[PDB]
DNA sequence: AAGAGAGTGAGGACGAACGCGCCCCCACCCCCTTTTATAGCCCCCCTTC
DNA sequence: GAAGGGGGGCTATAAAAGGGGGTGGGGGCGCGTTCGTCCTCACTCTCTT
C-alpha cells in the first residue's frame, strides 16, 4: 500500500466494459448540456443466430445510430483511472469494441461540410488591398525608443569621480566575494569612470593572463 | 552621414523629403540629421535650392488619397499664400499641410487635421495656426476654376 | 632440416598546425553644462463644454 | 471624455572650460577541423637451433 500502488480490484472481479467509437457531433450535442444526466438510450436486439446493436438520439438533444461490433481477440485492452487524490485504480477489462455510423448518407455529408468549413475559419488567407498602405514610416522627429533611452541616460547622468579612499574600500570589500573580476563587470559594481577606475586598479591591482578565456584583472595587488 | 546624404540627394533631385520623413526611415534622430546635413554642405561646398510648398503636394495628396483637383487647388492655395505673404516665417511643410486641409475641406474628400498631420509630419496645432492665417483670404487663394463641394464661406473656422 | 624475430605491405588512433573566429584595449571624437537674443515648431498639462 | 488654449520645452548660433562615454581600428588568444607521424596487425624469409 503506497501512493504508486494500483488498485487492481477491478481486474480481480473480471468486470467487462465496451469500447465505442462515436463521431464528434453526437458527443458535441452531449457536451452542449453535459449535465442533465441523460443523452439517449442504448438498445440491443438479439436473434437466434444474430445480434444487432443500435442507439437512438434523445428527442430533446436533437432539437438512428446503428452500432457495428469488432473483434477484440487481436488486442487486449484494459481501462484504468487516476484519482485526483493520487489513487490509481483499474475500472475493468474491455470485452467488446463497437463503432457508430450515420443512418443518413446524402444529407449527412452536408453536416460534415459545415464542420470542414467551420474548421476552416482559423485558416487565414492573404487579403487583396484596394489602396496601397500609406501609414508606414510616418514622419517623426524622433523615435519613441530613442527619446526614452535618451531621457533615461539624462536622468541617470554620468558617473562621477569618487574619492580614492571610498573607491578603494569598495574594491577591497568586493574582492572577498570572488577571486577575480572583469573590468566591465567591476565598473558596474564600483560605478566609477573607466579611465579613473583603471588608474586606481593599476596603482594596486594587476592583470593576469589566463589561458581559458582571456587576460583578466586580479584584485590582489600581489 | 548617410541619412543626411539621403536628404541632400532628395533635395538635389527636385523631390525633397522633409527631415521627419528621412528620420522615419533611419534610426538617427531628426536633430542629428540636421547637424550632419549642415556639415556635409560645408564639406562639399555645395548648396540645395530652398524647398517650396509645391515640392510636397504630390506626395502628401497622393498619400492622403485626395483627387487630382484637390491637389491642384492645394498647390495653388499654398503658392498664392506664400506670394501674398500671408504666412511669413512659417515652414513650407506647415503651409502645405494647411493648404491641403483648406482644399480638402472644400471638396467631397474631406481629411481631418490629424490625418494631414500624420502624412505631413506636422502637428495639428501647427496646421491650425497656419490655416487660421490663410482662412480669411480663402476665396482669393482658391483657383478661379474650382468647384466647391462646400462653399468657401462655409469652410471650417478655427 | 625446424622455432621466434623481422620485412613488408597495409590499416587505424592521436598531436601539431591551420584557420577562424569572438572578445578586448587604445586613439579619437562627441557630448555634457552655462549664458543670451531671436522665431517657429512641438509636447505636457490645464480648462471649457 | 473630446477638444482648445496656456505654459513650457527643443533647435540653431557663437565661444571657453574639463572629463565621462560611445565608437572605430587594430590586437589578442581559445576552440572546432585536418593531415602526417606514430602505432597495430596478416602473410612470407632468416639466424639460431
Swiss-Prot record, chain A:
Kindly list the biological process annotations in GO that this record carries: positive regulation of transcription by RNA polymerase II; transcription by RNA polymerase II; transcription elongation by RNA polymerase II; transcription initiation at RNA polymerase II promoter
Please give the GO cellular component terms listed in this UniProt entry: microtubule cytoskeleton; nucleoplasm; nucleus; transcription factor TFIIF complex
Q: Does the keyword Transcription regulation apply?
A: yes
Q: Which residues carry this modification: N6-acetyllysine?
A: 21, 32, 121
Main localization of the protein described in the UniProt heading: nucleus
Keyword DNA-binding among record annotations: yes
Q: Which residues carry this modification: N-acetylalanine?
A: 1
Question: So where does DNA get bound?
Answer: 211, 213
Q: Name one GO molecular function term.
A: DNA binding
| Transmembrane stretches, start-end | none
Sites where Phosphoserine occurs are at 126
Superkingdom of this protein's organism = Eukaryota
Which keywords has UniProt assigned to this entry?
Answer: Acetylation, DNA-binding, Nucleus, Phosphoprotein, Transcription, Transcription regulation
Localization (cell): Nucleus
PANTHER family of this UniProt entry?
Answer: GENERAL TRANSCRIPTION FACTOR IIF SUBUNIT 2
The record's similarity note reads: Belongs to the TFIIF beta subunit family.
Q: How does it assemble?
A: Heterodimer of an alpha and a beta subunit. Interacts with HTATSF1 and GPBP1. Interacts with URI1. Interacts with GTF2B (via N-terminus); this interaction is inhibited in presence of GTF2F1.
Q: According to its UniProt entry, what is the function of this protein?
A: TFIIF is a general transcription initiation factor that binds to RNA polymerase II and helps to recruit it to the initiation complex in collaboration with TFIIB.
What's the protein here called?
Answer: General transcription factor IIF subunit 2
Q: Which organism is it from?
A: Homo sapiens
Q: What is the lineage of its organism?
A: Eukaryota, Metazoa, Chordata, Craniata, Vertebrata
Curated annotation (Swiss-Prot), chain B:
Q: How is it modified after translation?
A: Acetylated. Autoacetylated; autoacetylation at Lys-80 stimulates transcription activation.
UniProt repeat feature sequence, residue ranges: 60-136
Q: What does this protein do?
A: General transcription factor that plays a role in transcription initiation by RNA polymerase II (Pol II). Involved in the pre-initiation complex (PIC) formation and Pol II recruitment at promoter DNA. Together with the TATA box-bound TBP forms the core initiation complex and provides a bridge between TBP and the Pol II-TFIIF complex. Released from the PIC early following the onset of transcription during the initiation and elongation transition and reassociates with TBP during the next transcription cycle. Associates with chromatin to core promoter-specific regions.
Mutating residue 31 to E: effect? Inhibits interaction with SSU72. Reduces interaction with SSU72. Inhibits interaction with VP16. Inhibits RNA pol II transcription activation induced by VP16 but does not affect basal transcription
Name the keywords, alphabetized: Acetylation, Acyltransferase, Chromosome, DNA-binding, Host-virus interaction, Metal-binding, Nucleus, Phosphoprotein, Repeat, Transcription, Transcription regulation, Transferase, Zinc, Zinc-finger
**Any one GO BP annotation for this protein:** RNA polymerase II core complex assembly
Name of the molecule in the record: Transcription initiation factor IIB
Catalytic activity, as annotated: L-lysyl-[protein] + acetyl-CoA = N(6)-acetyl-L-lysyl-[protein] + CoA + H(+)
Tell me how this protein assembles. Found in a ternary complex with TATA box-bound TBP. Part of a TFIID-containing RNA polymerase II pre-initiation complex (PIC) that is composed of TBP and at least GTF2A1, GTF2A2, GTF2E1, GTF2E2, GTF2F1, GTF2H2, GTF2H3, GTF2H4, GTF2H5, GTF2B, TCEA1, ERCC2, ERCC3, TAF1, TAF2, TAF3, TAF4, TAF5, TAF6, TAF7, TAF8, TAF9, TAF10, TAF11, TAF12 and TAF13. Associates with TFIID-TFIIA (DA complex) to form TFIID-TFIIA-TFIIB (DAB complex), which is then recognized by RNA polymerase II (Pol II). Found in a RNA polymerase II initiation complex. (Microbial infection) Interacts with HIV-1 Vpr.
Tissues in which the protein is found: Expressed in the inner cell mass forming the embryoblast. Not detected in cells from the outer thin layer trophoblast (at protein level).
User: Does the entry feature the keyword Transcription, yes or no?
Assistant: yes
What does altering residue 42 to E do?
Reduces interaction with SSU72. Inhibits interaction with VP16. Inhibits RNA pol II transcription activation induced by VP16 but does not affect basal transcription
Which family is this sequence assigned to? Answer: Belongs to the TFIIB family.
Result of mutating residue 27 to E? Reduces interaction with SSU72. Inhibits interaction with VP16. Inhibits RNA pol II transcription activation induced by VP16 but does not affect basal transcription
List its EC numbers. Answer: 2.3.1.48
Please give the residue positions where the record annotates the modification N6-acetyllysine: 80
Organism superkingdom: Eukaryota
Q: Region Core promoter DNA-binding: list its residue ranges.
A: 31-35, 91-94, 125-128
Q: Where is this region: Necessary for TATA box-bound TBP complex formation?
A: 86-158
Documented effect of changing residue 89 to V: Inhibits interaction with TBP
- Gene designation per UniProt: GTF2B
Impact of mutating residue 132 to E?
Inhibits interaction with RNA polymerase II
Q: What is the effect of changing residue 27 to L?
A: Reduces interaction with VP16
Q: Which residues bind DNA?
A: 31, 38, 90, 114, 123, 126, 128, 132
Location of this fragment in the whole protein: 159 to 316 of 316
Amino acid at each position: 500500500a503506497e501512493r504508486g500502488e494500483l488498485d487492481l480490484t477491478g481486474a480481480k472481479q473480471n468486470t467487462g466494459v465496451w469500447l465505442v467509437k462515436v463521431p464528434k457531433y453526437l458527443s458535441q450535442q452531449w457536451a452542449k448540456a453535459s449535465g442533465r444526466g441523460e443523452v439517449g438510450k442504448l438498445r440491443i436486439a438479439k436473434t437466434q443466430g444474430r445480434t444487432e446493436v443500435s442507439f437512438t438520439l434523445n428527442e430533446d438533444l436533437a432539437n438512428e445510430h446503428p452500432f457495428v461490433l469488432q473483434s477484440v481477440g487481436g488486442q487486449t485492452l484494459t481501462v484504468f483511472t487516476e484519482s485526483s487524490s493520487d489513487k490509481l485504480s483499474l475500472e475493468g477489462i474491455v470485452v467488446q469494441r463497437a463503432e457508430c455510423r450515420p443512418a443518413a448518407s446524402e444529407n449527412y455529408m452536408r453536416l460534415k461540410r459545415l464542420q470542414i468549413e467551420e474548421s476552416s475559419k482559423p485558416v487565414r488567407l492573404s487579403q487583396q488591398l484596394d489602396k496601397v498602405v500609406t501609414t508606414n514610416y510616418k514622419p517623426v522627429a524622433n523615435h519613441q525608443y530613442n527619446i526614452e533611452y535618451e531621457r533615461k541616460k539624462k536622468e541617470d547622468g554620468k558617473r562621477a569621480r569618487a574619492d580614492k579612499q571610498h573607491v578603494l574600500d569598495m574594491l577591497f570589500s568586493a574582492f572577498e566575494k570572488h577571486q577575480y573580476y572583469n573590468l566591465k563587470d567591476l565598473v558596474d559594481i564600483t560605478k566609477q569612470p573607466v579611465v579613473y577606475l583603471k588608474e586606481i586598479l593599476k596603482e594596486i591591482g594587476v592583470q593576469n593572463v589566463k589561458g581559458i578565456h582571456k587576460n583578466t584583472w586580479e584584485l590582489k595587488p600581489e | 552621414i548617410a541619412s543626411a546624404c539621403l536628404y541632400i540627394a532628395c533635395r538635389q533631385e527636385g523631390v525633397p523629403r522633409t527631415f521627419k520623413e528621412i528620420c522615419a526611415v533611419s534610426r538617427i534622430s531628426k536633430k542629428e540629421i540636421g547637424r550632419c546635413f549642415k556639415l556635409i554642405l560645408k564639406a562639399l561646398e555645395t548648396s540645395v535650392d530652398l524647398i517650396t510648398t509645391g515640392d510636397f503636394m504630390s506626395r502628401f495628396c497622393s498619400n492622403l488619397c485626395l483627387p487630382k483637383q484637390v491637389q491642384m487647388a492645394a498647390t495653388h492655395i499654398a503658392r498664392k499664400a506664400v506670394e501674398l505673404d500671408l504666412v511669413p516665417g512659417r515652414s513650407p511643410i506647415s503651409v502645405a499641410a494647411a493648404a491641403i486641409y483648406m482644399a480638402s475641406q472644400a471638396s467631397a474628400e474631406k481629411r481631418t487635421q490629424k490625418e494631414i498631420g500624420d502624412i505631413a509630419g506636422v502637428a495639428d496645432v501647427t496646421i491650425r495656426q497656419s490655416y487660421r492665417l490663410i482662412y480669411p483670404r480663402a476665396p482669393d487663394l482658391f483657383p478661379t476654376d474650382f468647384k466647391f463641394d462646400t462653399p468657401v464661406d462655409k469652410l471650417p473656422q478655427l
